[PDB]
RNA sequence: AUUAUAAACCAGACCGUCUCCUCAUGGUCAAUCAAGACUAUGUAGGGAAUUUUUGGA
């Protein structure tokens, strides 16, 4: 329940908790909640929202952890516009060999598979000339373990005491890699940011780059603190009474992580954004029939019970039990009066009634953003073609959860050669939409997809089936 | 526009000689000029590579099949340029 | 040097040569130092100085000057006229521009060379993360049209956050606007702790 | 789009162009036109090794060329598919 | 007066006898009847027969669409 | 031959150029008028023949050239 | 383009070159020796430091160079003197160097 | 695009020299911008008649002396 | 231009040595006495290990030569010479267009650098220029006797960098001292890791 | 402007070029013809509108016979630019 | 009285530092009852199958 901040895929989650709470006070039901989470600075407030008493609400310090962790944060010049630099790499290497020379075992975190590859060769280079390039083990032992060779790019890095881990290997290969760490064979493991889920417990933790590229905004972002947490989250098993994190940051984001890895994460709503879709859904379910129902719903939520503390975060200048209420009302009006412009809902005077149209109803059923549904509405019409439909699908808001790494646009362009359909003239080439369009074709035509893109494709496909249903049964409507 | 065309136009009423693909040279008056370099002549001399030279009254020539066209030295600096 | 005053008595000219080769350096260094310190007054002024050094002209010398392709008569007209430059940039119609560049000739050209000039309807609301901490959500629009001869491989922009006075920098960053960015309503965030007072 | 856009990029490279009537001419490409008119600073000749007829600076009419070879051994191509799209910023 | 763009129309209408001429080999020339309306000089001609004409002859042929580039005579 | 790193046709206007044609008849003449087709008007014509060894000469005209049958243009000796 | 009042000297045939002669003027002064005609070249140290141009005879006036380093009149530094001498004789053409 | 000024040459018998040693003659009934001469006589070189009216492709027509000046 | 077709009194002793063994060499020998020629020879020797006699394709990406002249004029002079005597193998011998640090990647593609000691130091100190120095096999140091003047502190620094710093590659490039005749040739040799060879 | 020419992009893959497009996509050897008694072979790489093509690993096969004979001369060429007017027949071989 | 010479920062590799011609574009001018030369945008095109540069060797 710390992740109810992070973005909106958060606010989604937040929503559900709120919904559950509401249900509990509409089914008079003895529902139990167990809100397990990170250390949160505000967390009493959160608890209060989540139907609790000060007794049951156990917010702690992160220093209360038990394998005590020494976080070393290291900032570098010229980094804020790149993933990692050479000084950083050097530092990592130094720290890596410090672990390998000791009994401890370290793991580096990185942005992506490409990054890992870059590190691996570089790491090897660093090693060769220096004493340490040992696997703690013979050169003819490892080849038996890596008989399968898929992908073969892992082999050569893996062969000299420096393994790879990226999102979506051959599962068997991944397992083998894991075993090689656990067993004590492989010395250092390189990890892509996406693979934080693959919790291989390590002693030292290198974080090479707190900065992640994305065609999202055509620019390098920063590892949002949740992501970082997983590496402070994974601690030492071998050397008890010791934990260690080398962190390779920007000078700017020292002061973010220097604050927010040792102190509790502050919790704030992103509900403010999504309310359009959520509200629509609520309306469809028909508990909402008014401009006070919405307010009531809000009141059974984290937004309302958060906003009272930091309201300047959520833009509430008045800050009074009147003023706040007024603000809320305004917000709900805003939410509604988009949903009247788009074909979502209807309102009339006699307290005063609210009801759906298909557009709204379909959205509610299939869980697709008002934003996305609006987009769908205008481009889809009578005598729209298959290609057009595909294009429309590809510009759903949904796919903002799809990475576009450094040089992925180029790759896409290259691929465009082998495609059946072609994209429209009047849209962007950097956008996720473009990626979606080509990576819908990429598996329609049974193509040879790069293992990076495979993940992306999978992600896209996670979304598509509701979206396609919507498309078919917006047209039907 | 193309300056050679302009020059040609200007030299309407000059003793212009010629040379074609085959090499059948000529030398008579310039009757008219066009964008595509179509030419007509008067009192035209026929002096071919075959040897059998003749004297013809009028002749019209296709522009595409021209190799080059001869002009006198009068319209050299002025007035066509600036 | 800033004003381009190439010389007769070349001893001076020799001396000025040195400055030319080494001014931009020193000025840049000074600017950097200021930035590090966190001092507004010089650093903005220092940035200006640096720019001048780079492009051999003063602040009051009208920026068109720094395109390769604009003509001399126009620049002179621009200079004397005592118009807030921004006004010219704001103007919409090339005819209008022509009318108000004392030269209805080249008006279109100049317009093309104003939609060829950098310019950003930036917006930025901050939100207080916690008591000390402040996120600042910046929304930078790049309103200009790129050109690989003119604007270069990228268009840097040293973003300052600075105080109510304009004395002290709070937090700064370089950001490279790329061709790719331009026009996209593109965000940028940073967090700033605060002073007790 | 076009393969003359390929030779548009290659400023200043050494080639020995096979012309249609048959010739060997080592020279610097400079800038080629969209009607394949290239500009050649230094030259070696063959009038109809083959004898050096003693010319230096040629400028090609783009009709003449059969085969261009040996400026550079690379493979880099596209451009217009990028530019059409990133100009769609605001409606 | 007779323009050639309307001449094609006439040809289409009447269905006349024809003797087409070629470029490279002056000796070989085609004979038949022209059919098609077209913007290029290209036209389709049923009952094509290439004949060796006396340069200073029993040879028949099938049916042809001759390229607009290589046509050197039309008679109607 | 003395001719420098000349970038384009407009930068080498009014030079005494050798010119080459389809049949093999070589020319010499001062370049007057650039064009789309390279119908380059010469200040004076001296065409030269070789039989199908050794080169001959002619001098009839001061010509407007036509581009169709040209091969390429080469500088001989600049004016002034 | 000869500005100062050195043009008269040039005309006479005993010119000079120093940091303080124009990029072109100074180049000219150099090249007015390499074309051949300059009979005598007065100077300050620049030539020795920079440009190869050897000339069969070389005088060096003075002892005390005033360095701003000290803020005082020194004597001639050997590291400079030797360099100056190194012009000496014309290596390609002539026999020795005065 | 510019029309050939062959209204001068209209209704006069012309002695052509078409491509490849081919001397043909006929009256100019009709002309065009492409030069596809719509002429009304066809005889070869001595002489023999072959076809009455004849439309030729302009690409293969070069020299055309009007018999009547 | 093989005028004499036979090397001077200096090179005739050194030539074999230059070609024989890749040692850190050094020559204190009279001013304007085939130093350039010697340098060229050294360069050629260096190139031997990368560029093949059978496969005449020049091995570009591997070797990168540096030339530390003291004066910019001198550098300019020498660049031309380099171009002249190594356009046959087809070497692109440029002096440095420095400009900016992250922009200093022109130099990475170039084969031979003639750069001023100060400039070199700037190049070799800055972070994303470490790639350059590893490709540097040939550091040629003209007029080392500058060391005595307050400039050649930079030379000393450079030397220090070349030995001490690059240990994470650890593959030390060939040094070639060049100078006019001066004593303490022993000391200099010691400094530069030079034997009696 | 954009639609009128870019629609002809699929006209490669439908029209008579389709074969050579395919070849280009999956590099394969093809007989390459010319005007003056010529025969050429190579694999396809980059493709255009008007047959101005580029290939790799190229073999020229042609004759200079001064006296009623055949002398099939052979030389290796790489990364060319044949002007498409000269090309006549090309075909994908197995 | 009055002072040698001399080197230097910073953005760049995921990236088209740079076009000869025609058409349109708006702003101009030079002008007669609806048409021509210039800057400027590349947003157009260049097998317009024949009058030129995509095939008569």
Rounded to whole angstroms, the Cα distance separating C157 from C148 reads: 17
Q: Give chain J's domain count.
A: 1
Cα separations (Å) of C104 from C62, C109, F70? Answer: 18, 10, 44
Give strand pairing partners of A87.
none
Rounded to whole angstroms, the Cα distance separating A35 from A21 reads: 12
Under DSSP, is residue C184 helix (H, G, I), strand (E, B) or coil? coil
Query: What phi and psi, each to the nearest 5 degrees, are found at residue J57?
Result: 55, 65
Closest CA of chain D from C108, distance in Å: 21
Residue F11: DSSP 8-state:
G
Is C118 buried (19+), middle (13-18) or exposed (0-12) by CB count in 10 A?
middle
Work out whether the CA dihedral G84, G88, G91, G93 comes out positive or negative. Answer: positive
**Structure determined via:** cryo-EM
Whether chain D has a CB inside 8 Å of the CB on A422: the answer is no
Rounded to whole angstroms, the Cα distance separating C118 from C146 reads: 9
Q: Report the chain A residue with the minimal C-alpha distance to residue I169.
A: A129
Rounded to whole angstroms, the Cα distance separating F35 from F65 reads: 10
Give strand pairing partners of C125.
C137
Contact between residue A200 and residue A189 where contact means Cβ atoms under 8 Å apart: yes
Strands (E), A77-194: 106-110, 163-165, 189-192
Rounded to whole angstroms, the Cα distance separating C173 from J88 reads: 61
Resolution in angstroms for this experimental structure?
Answer: 4.2
Q: Count CB atoms within 10 A of the CB of residue A64.
A: 7
Upstream peptide bond of B79 is cis (omega within 30 degrees of 0): yes
Rounded to whole angstroms, the Cα distance separating A81 from A222 reads: 10
At which residue do the structure tokens 């522009």 appear?
A: B63
Contact between residue I145 and residue I179 where contact means Cβ atoms under 8 Å apart: yes
Under DSSP, is residue G77 helix (H, G, I), strand (E, B) or coil? coil
Q: Which residues from A are below 8 Å from J when comparing CB atoms? A: 417-418, 422, 425
Rounded to whole angstroms, the Cα distance separating E51 from D57 reads: 51
Q: A378: closest CA among A412, A342, A344?
A: A342
Contact between residue A274 and residue A335 where contact means Cβ atoms under 8 Å apart: no
Q: A17: closest CA among A332, A313, A356, A301?
A: A301
CA–C1' distance C68–K35 (Å)? 36
Same domain for A161 and A174, yes or no, is yes
Q: C116: closest CA among C88, C157, C146?
A: C146
Work out whether the CA dihedral A128, A134, A137, A143 comes out positive or negative. Answer: negative
Q: Say if J and B touch: at least 3 Cβ pairs within 8 Å.
A: no
Give C62-93 as a DSSP string: -GGGGSSSS-HHHHHHHHHT---HHHHHH---
D58-60/D39-40 β-pairing: antiparallel
Q: I118: closest CA among I157, I82, I62, I148?
A: I157
Q: What would you measure as the largest C-alpha separation in chain H, in angstroms? A: 40
Half-sphere exposure of C85 (CA within 13 A, CB side): 13
Half-sphere exposure of C150 (CA within 13 A, CB side): 20
Chain H interface test: which of B30, B58, B64 (most H C-beta within 10 Å): B58
Q: Write down the domain spans for chain H.
A: 1-69
Smallest CA–C1' distance to K45, residue: J1
Query: Which residue segment(s) compose the domain that J89 sits in?
Result: 1-94
Rounded to whole angstroms, the Cα distance separating A307 from A315 reads: 9
Look at F65 and B68 and tell me if their CB atoms are within 8 Å. yes
I93-95/I25-28 β-pairing: unpaired
Rounded to whole angstroms, the Cα distance separating I150 from G69 reads: 11
Contact between residue A190 and residue A116 where contact means Cβ atoms under 8 Å apart: yes
Tell me the CATH number of domain H1-69, given options 2.30.30.100, 1.10.4080.10, 2.40.50.140, 3.30.465.10: 2.30.30.100
**After which residues does chain C break, using C–N > 2.5 Å?**
none
The CATH number of the domain holding residue E63 is 2.30.30.100
What contacts G53, CB < 8 A, 6 or more positions away?
A: G30, G33, G34, G47, G87
Structure tokens at C94: 């090339």
CA–C1' distance A407–K14 (Å)? 4
Contact between residue J34 and residue J53 where contact means Cβ atoms under 8 Å apart: no
Round to the nearest angstrom and report the end-to-end CA distance of chain C. Answer: 45
Upstream peptide bond of G58 is cis (omega within 30 degrees of 0): no
Rounded to whole angstroms, the Cα distance separating E45 from E64 reads: 5
Look at A129 and I168 and tell me if their CB atoms are within 8 Å. yes
Same domain for A339 and A372, yes or no, is no
Look at J86 and D84 and tell me if their CB atoms are within 8 Å. no
Task: Identify the helix (H) or strand (E) that includes residue B17.
Answer: strand B15-20
Q: Count CB atoms within 10 A of the CB of residue G22.
A: 20
What contacts A30, CB < 8 A, 6 or more positions away?
A: none
Query: Which residue segment(s) compose the domain that A416 sits in?
Result: 357-477
Under DSSP, is residue C36 helix (H, G, I), strand (E, B) or coil? helix
Contact between residue B46 and residue H23 where contact means Cβ atoms under 8 Å apart: no
Q: Give chain F's domain count.
A: 1
Residue A2: DSSP 8-state:
G
| Sequence-distant contacts of G45-53: CB under 8 A, at least 24 apart | G45/G80, G45/G84, G46/G17, G46/G18, G46/G19, G47/G17, G47/G87, G48/G80, G48/G83, G48/G84, G48/G86, G48/G87, G49/G83, G49/I71, G50/I71, G50/I73, G50/I74, G51/I73, G51/I77, G52/I32, G52/I77, G53/G87
**Nearest CB to G50; choose among I33, I73, I149:** I73
Structure tokens at A226: 């949740």
Tell whether I34 is in a known binding site.
yes
At which residue do the structure tokens 């639609």 appear?
A: J3
Residues of G in contact with C6 (CB under 8 A): none
Tell whether I53 is in a known binding site.
no
Is F67 buried (19+), middle (13-18) or exposed (0-12) by CB count in 10 A?
middle
Chain A interface test: which of D75, D79, D85, D90 (most A C-beta within 10 Å): D85
* Residues composing chain H: 69
Distance of CA A308 to the CA centre of its chain: 27
Rounded to whole angstroms, the Cα distance separating A473 from A461 reads: 19
Query: What phi and psi, each to the nearest 5 degrees, are found at residue I88?
Result: -75, -40
Cα separations (Å) of C18 from C13, C22, I122? Answer: 9, 6, 18
Q: Give chain I's domain count.
A: 1
What contacts E10, CB < 8 A, 6 or more positions away?
A: E76
Q: Which residues from H are below 8 Å from B when comparing CB atoms? A: 1-2, 4-6, 8-9, 35, 58-59, 61-66, 69
Give chain H as a DSSP string: -PPP--SSSTTSEEEEEBTTTB--EEEEEE--SS---EES--EE---EE--SSEE--GGG--EEEES--
Chain K: bases < 7 Å from a protein Cβ: 3-22, 26-29, 36-37, 39-47, 49-57
Contact between residue J62 and residue J33 where contact means Cβ atoms under 8 Å apart: no
Q: A430: closest CA among A401, A407, A458?
A: A407
Strands (E), chain I: 25-28, 64-68, 93-95, 112-115, 136-141, 174-179
Under DSSP, is residue B46 helix (H, G, I), strand (E, B) or coil? strand
Cα-Cα-Cα-Cα dihedral of C170, C171, C176, C177, to 10°? -60
Contact between residue A261 and residue A228 where contact means Cβ atoms under 8 Å apart: yes
Closest CA of chain G from C8, distance in Å: 7
CA–C1' distance A168–K41 (Å)? 49
Contact between residue A201 and residue A184 where contact means Cβ atoms under 8 Å apart: no
The CATH number of the domain holding residue I197 is 3.40.50.300
Work out whether the CA dihedral C62, C65, C67, C71 comes out positive or negative. Answer: positive
A243-250/A204-208 β-pairing: parallel
Query: Which residue segment(s) compose the domain that E49 sits in?
Result: 1-76
Q: Report the chain D residue with the minimal C-alpha distance to residue J49.
A: D2
Work out whether the CA dihedral C45, C46, C51, C53 comes out positive or negative. Answer: positive
CA–C1' distance A406–K21 (Å)? 40
Q: SS3 string of F18-70?
A: EEEECCCCEEEEEEEECCCCCCCEECCCCCECCCCCCCCCCCCCEEEECCCCE
Contact between residue A345 and residue A357 where contact means Cβ atoms under 8 Å apart: yes
Work out whether the CA dihedral B59, B63, B67, B69 comes out positive or negative. Answer: positive
What contacts E51, CB < 8 A, 6 or more positions away?
A: E28, E29, E30, E31, E57, E59
Give D32-68 as a DSSP string: PPTT---EESS---------------EEE-TTSEEE-
Query: Which residue segment(s) compose the domain that D29 sits in?
Result: 1-91
Structure tokens at A229: 């947490």
Rounded to whole angstroms, the Cα distance separating D47 from F49 reads: 12
Return the CA Rg of chain F.
13
Q: I58: closest CA among I98, I38, I86, I95?
A: I86
Closest CA of chain B from F62, distance in Å: 6
Half-sphere exposure of J86 (CA within 13 A, CB side): 24
Look at H69 and B32 and tell me if their CB atoms are within 8 Å. no
Give A249-302 as a DSSP string: EEHHHHHHHHHHTTSPBP----HHHHHHHHHHHHHHHTS--STTHHHHHHHSSH
Q: Count CB atoms within 10 A of the CB of residue A215.
A: 22
Round to the nearest angstrom and report the end-to-end CA distance of chain B. Answer: 13
Distance of CA I5 to the CA centre of its chain: 25
**Nearest CB to J49; choose among D2, D20, D66:** D2
The CATH number of the domain holding residue J27 is 2.30.30.100
Crossing angle of the two packed helices A358-366 and A451-475, in degrees rounded to 10? 150
Rounded to whole angstroms, the Cα distance separating I60 from A471 reads: 57
Smallest CA–C1' distance to K27, residue: C108
Same domain for A276 and A148, yes or no, is no
Q: Give chain E's domain count.
A: 1
Q: SS3 string of A9-76?
A: HHHHHHHHHHHHHHHHCCCCCCCCCCCCCCCECCHHHHHHHCCCCHHHCCCCCHHHCCCCEEEEEEEE
Crossing angle of the two packed helices I35-48 and I11-20, in degrees rounded to 10? 20
Structure tokens at F10: 């407009």
Look at G50 and I71 and tell me if their CB atoms are within 8 Å. yes
Residue I165: DSSP 8-state:
I
Rounded to whole angstroms, the Cα distance separating B33 from B7 reads: 10
Smallest CA–C1' distance to K56, residue: E24
Give strand pairing partners of A191.
A109, A165
Rounded to whole angstroms, the Cα distance separating A218 from A238 reads: 41
Contact between residue I74 and residue I119 where contact means Cβ atoms under 8 Å apart: no
Look at A429 and D78 and tell me if their CB atoms are within 8 Å. no
Q: Report the chain J residue with the minimal C-alpha distance to residue A421.
A: J10
Rounded to whole angstroms, the Cα distance separating H36 from A74 reads: 83
A69-76/A243-250 β-pairing: parallel
What domains appear along chain B, each with residue ranges and CATH number?
Answer: 1-82 (2.30.30.100)
At which residue do the structure tokens 């800050």 appear?
A: A319
């Amino acid at each position: 329940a710390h992740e109810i901040s992070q973005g909106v895929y958060g606010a989604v989650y937040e929503t559900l908790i709120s919904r559950m709470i509401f249900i509990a006070t509409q089914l008079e039901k003895k529902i139990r909640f167990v809100c397990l989470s990170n250390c949160l600075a505000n967390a009493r407030d959160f608890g209060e929202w989540a139907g609790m008493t000060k007794s049951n609400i156990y917010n702690f310090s992160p220093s209360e952890r038990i394998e005590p962790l020494e976080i070393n944060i290291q900032s570098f010049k010229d980094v804020e516009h790149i993933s990692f630099n050479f000084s950083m790499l050097q530092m990592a290497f130094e720290a890596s060999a410090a672990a390998a020379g000791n009994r401890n075992s370290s793991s580096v975190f990185l942005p992506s598979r490409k990054d890992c590859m870059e590190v691996a060769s570089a790491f090897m280079k660093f090693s060769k000339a220096i004493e340490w390039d040992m696997l703690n083990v013979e050169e003819e032992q490892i080849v038996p373990y890596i008989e399968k060779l898929t992908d073969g790019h892992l082999r050569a890095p893996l062969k000299h005491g420096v393994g790879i881990l990226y999102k979506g290997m051959a599962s068997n290969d991944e397992r083998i890699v894991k075993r090689l760490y656990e067993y004590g064979a492989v010395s250092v493991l390189l990890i892509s940011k996406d693979c934080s889920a693959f919790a291989c417990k390590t002693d030292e933790v290198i974080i090479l780059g707190t900065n992640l590229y994305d065609g999202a905004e055509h620019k390098y972002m920063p590892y949002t603190i949740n992501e970082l947490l997983e590496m402070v989250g994974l601690a030492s098993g071998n050397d008890s009474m010791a934990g260690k994190v080398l962190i390779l940051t920007s000078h700017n984001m020292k002061a973010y992580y220097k604050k927010f890895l040792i102190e509790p994460l502050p919790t704030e709503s992103y509900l403010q954004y999504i309310i359009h879709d959520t509200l629509n859904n609520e309306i469809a379910n028909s508990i909402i029939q008014s401009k006070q129902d919405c307010v009531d719903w809000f009141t059974y939520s984290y937004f309302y019970r958060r906003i009272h503390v930091n309201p300047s975060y959520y833009g509430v200048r008045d800050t009074s039990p009147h003023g706040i209420s007024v603000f809320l009302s305004n917000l709900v009006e805003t939410c509604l009066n988009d949903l009247v412009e788009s074909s979502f809902i209807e309102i009339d005077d006699t307290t005063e009634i609210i009801s759906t149209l298909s557009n709204g109803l379909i959205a509610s059923h299939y869980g697709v953003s008002f934003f996305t549904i609006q987009s769908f509405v205008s481009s889809l019409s009578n005598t729209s073609t298959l290609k057009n439909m595909l294009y429309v699908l590809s510009t759903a808001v949904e796919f903002e959860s799809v990475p576009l790494r450094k040089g992925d646009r180029a790759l896409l362009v290259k691929l465009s050669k082998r495609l059946p359909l072609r994209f429209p003239e009047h849209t962007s080439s950097g956008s996720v939409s473009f990626k979606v369009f080509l990576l819908l074709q990429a598996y329609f035509s049974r193509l040879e997809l790069p293992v990076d893109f495979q993940n992306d494709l999978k992600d896209i496909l996670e979304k598509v089936v509701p979206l396609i249903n919507v498309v078919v049964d917006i047209l039907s409507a | 526009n193309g300056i050679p065309v302009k020059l040609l136009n200007e030299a309407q009423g000059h003793i212009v000689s010629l040379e074609l693909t085959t090499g059948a040279t000529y030398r008579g008056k310039l009757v008219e000029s066009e964008d595509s370099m179509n030419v007509q002549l008067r009192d035209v001399i026929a002096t071919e590579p075959q040897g059998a030279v003749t004297h013809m009254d009028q002749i019209f020539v296709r522009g595409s099949q021209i190799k080059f066209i001869v002009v006198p030295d009068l319209l050299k600096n002025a007035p066509l340029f600036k | 040097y800033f004003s381009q005053l190439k010389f007769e008595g070349f001893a001076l000219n020799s001396d000025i040569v040195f400055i030319h080769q080494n001014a931009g350096r020193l000025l840049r260094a000074m600017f950097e130092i200021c930035l590090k310190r966190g001092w507004g007054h010089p650093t903005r002024m220092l940035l200006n100085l640096c720019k001048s050094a780079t492009t051999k002209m003063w602040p009051t010398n009208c920026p068109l000057r720094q395109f390769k392709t604009c003509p001399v008569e126009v620049i002179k007209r621009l200079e004397a006229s005592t118009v807030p430059w921004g006004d010219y940039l704001q103007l919409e119609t090339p005819a209008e521009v022509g009318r108000a560049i004392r030269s209805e000739k080249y008006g279109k050209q100049v317009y093309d060379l104003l939609k060829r000039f950098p310019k950003m309807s930036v917006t930025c609301n901050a939100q207080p993360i916690t008591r000390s901490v402040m996120r600042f959500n910046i929304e930078i629009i790049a309103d200009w049209i790129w050109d690989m001869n003119v604007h270069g491989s990228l268009e840097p922009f040293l973003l300052m956050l600075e105080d109510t006075d304009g004395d002290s920098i709070l937090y700064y960053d370089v950001l490279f606007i790329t061709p790719d960015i331009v026009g996209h309503e593109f965000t940028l965030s940073f967090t700033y702790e605060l002073k007790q007072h | 789009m076009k393969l003359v856009n390929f030779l548009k990029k290659l400023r200043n490279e050494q080639v020995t162009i096979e012309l249609k009537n048959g010739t060997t001419v080592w020279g610097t490409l400079q800038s080629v036109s969209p009607q394949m008119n290239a500009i050649l600073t230094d030259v070696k000749l063959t009038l109809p090794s083959d004898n050096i007829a003693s010319l230096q600076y040629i400028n090609i009419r783009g009709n003449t060329i059969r085969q261009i070879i040996l400026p550079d051994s690379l493979n880099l191509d596209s451009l217009l598919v990028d530019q059409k799209q990133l100009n769609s910023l605001r409606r | 007066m007779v323009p050639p763009i309307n001449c094609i129309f006439n040809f289409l209408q009447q269905q006349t006898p024809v003797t087409i001429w070629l470029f490279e080999q002056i000796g070989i020339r085609i004979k038949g009847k022209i059919v098609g309306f077209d913007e290029f000089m290209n036209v389709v001609i049923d009952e094509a027969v290439e004949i060796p004409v006396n340069s200073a002859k029993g040879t028949p042929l099938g049916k042809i669409l001759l390229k607009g580039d290589n046509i050197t005579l039309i008679t109607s | 031959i003395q001719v420098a790193h000349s970038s384009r046709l407009a930068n080498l206007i009014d030079y005494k150029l050798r010119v080459l044609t389809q049949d093999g008849r070589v020319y010499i003449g001062q370049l007057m008028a650039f064009d789309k087709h390279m119908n380059l008007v010469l200040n004076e014509c001296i065409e030269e023949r070789v039989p199908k060894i050794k080169v001959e000469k002619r001098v009839l005209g001061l010509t407007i050239l036509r581009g169709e049958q040209i091969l390429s243009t080469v500088v001989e000796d600049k004016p002034l | 383009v000869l500005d100062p009042s050195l043009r008269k000297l040039i005309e006479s045939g005993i010119g000079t070159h120093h940091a303080g002669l124009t990029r072109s003027d100074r180049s000219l002064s150099e090249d007015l020796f390499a074309d051949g005609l300059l009979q005598v070249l007065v100077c300050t140290a620049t030539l020795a430091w920079g440009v190869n141009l050897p000339a069969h005879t070389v005088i060096i006036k003075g002892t005390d160079v005033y360095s701003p380093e000290k803020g005082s009149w020194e004597q001639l530094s050997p590291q400079d003197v030797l360099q100056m001498l190194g012009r000496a004789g014309r290596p390609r053409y002539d026999t020795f160097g005065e | 695009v510019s029309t050939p000024e062959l209204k001068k040459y209209m209704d006069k018998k012309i002695l052509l020299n078409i491509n490849g040693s081919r001397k043909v003659a006929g009256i100019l009934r009709g002309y065009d911008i492409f030069l596809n001469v719509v002429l009304d006589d066809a005889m070869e070189i001595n002489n023999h008649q072959l076809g009455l009216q004849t439309v030729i492709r302009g690409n293969s027509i070069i020299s055309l002396e009007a018999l009547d000046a | 231009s093989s005028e004499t077709t036979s090397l001077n009194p200096i090179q005739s002793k050194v030539f074999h040595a230059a070609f024989e063994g890749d040692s850190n060499m050094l020559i204190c020998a009279p001013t304007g006495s085939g130093k350039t020629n010697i340098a060229l020879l050294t360069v050629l020797k260096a190139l031997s290990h990368h560029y093949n006699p059978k496969t005449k394709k020049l091995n570009l990406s591997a070797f990168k030569i540096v030339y530390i002249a003291p004066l910019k004029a001198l550098v300019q002079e020498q660049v031309r010479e380099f171009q002249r005597r190594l356009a046959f193998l087809g070497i692109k011998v440029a002096e440095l267009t420095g400009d900016s640090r992250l922009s200093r990647k022109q130099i990475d593609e170039t084969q031979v650098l003639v750069s001023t000691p100060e400039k070199w130091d700037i190049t070799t100190r800055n972070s994303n220029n470490l790639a350059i120095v590893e490709l540097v096999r040939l550091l040629i140091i003209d007029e080392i006797h500058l060391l005595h003047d307050d400039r050649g502190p930079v030379l000393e620094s450079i030397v220090a960098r070349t030995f001490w710093a690059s240990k994470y590659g650890q593959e030390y490039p060939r040094i070639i001292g060049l100078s006019a005749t001066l004593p303490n040739y022993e000391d200099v040799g010691r400094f530069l890791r030079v034997p009696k060879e | 402007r954009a639609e009128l020419e870019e629609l002809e992009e699929f006209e490669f893959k439908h029209g008579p070029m389709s074969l050579i497009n395919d070849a280009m996509v999956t590099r394969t050897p093809v007989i390459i013809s010319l005007r003056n008694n010529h025969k050429i072979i190579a694999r396809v790489k980059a493709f255009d509108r008007h047959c101005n093509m580029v290939l790799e690993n190229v073999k020229e096969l042609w004759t200079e016979k001064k006296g009623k004979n055949v002398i099939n001369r052979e030389r290796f060429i790489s990364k060319l630019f044949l002007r498409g007017d000269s090309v006549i027949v090309v075909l994908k071989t197995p």
